[PDB]
Design a protein around this ligand. Structure first.
Ligand SMILES: O=c1ccn([C@@H]2O[C@@H](CN3CCOCC3)[C@H](O)[C@H]2O)c(=O)[nH]1
Length: 124
C-alpha cells in the first residue's frame, strides 16, 4: 500500500531541486507523483528542503489546522517551496498547472509514532 508518512513524501517533498522549478515543473511533477490519476488535484505544494528539515517541523510552532484540529505545526524558518495551481483551461486527463516558487513558512499536520508530517496545511 502506502503509509500516511510515505503519501506526504510523495505528494509534498521534492528535495532534489533547490529552487529552479521551470514553467514546466508543476505539469511534470503533478503527473509523475500520481496527483493527476483520478482527477486534476487543484492545488499542491512541493517543499525543497531536506526530509529531516521538514520532519523537524513537527517539533516546531504548534498552530491550529485549517480544519480546526490542533496537530499542525509552522516552521520557524522559511522554506523553499513550489506551489502548483490548476489553470482555468486545464481539462482532465490533460491537467495543466501554473508553477510558482516561494520562500515561506510551511504549516503541516503531524501524526503517529514517530511523529511525522502527514498533511500539508498551508504556507504563510
Ligand atoms: O498551500 C497549500 C494548500 C493546500 N494544499 C493541498 O490541498 C489541501 C486540502 N485541500 C483543502 C480544500 O479541500 C481540498 C483539499 C491538501 O491537504 C494539500 O494536499 C497544498 O498542497 N498547499
Amino acid at each position: 500500500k502506502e503509509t500516511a508518512a510515505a503519501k506526504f513524501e510523495r505528494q509534498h517533498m521534492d528535495s532534489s531541486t533547490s529552487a529552479a522549478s521551470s514553467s514546466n515543473y508543476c505539469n511534470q511533477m503533478m503527473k509523475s507523483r500520481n496527483l493527476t490519476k483520478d482527477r486534476c488535484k487543484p492545488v499542491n505544494t512541493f517543499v525543497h528542503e531536506s526530509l529531516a528539515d521538514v520532519q523537524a517541523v513537527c517539533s516546531q510552532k504548534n498552530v491550529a489546522c485549517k480544519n480546526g484540529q490542533t496537530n499542525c505545526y509552522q516552521s520557524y524558518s522559511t522554506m523553499s517551496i513550489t506551489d502548483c495551481r490548476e489553470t482555468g483551461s486545464s481539462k482532465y486527463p490533460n491537467c495543466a498547472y501554473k508553477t510558482t516558487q516561494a520562500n515561506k513558512h510551511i504549516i503541516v499536520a503531524c501524526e503517529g509514532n514517530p511523529y511525522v508530517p502527514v498533511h500539508f496545511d498551508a504556507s504563510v
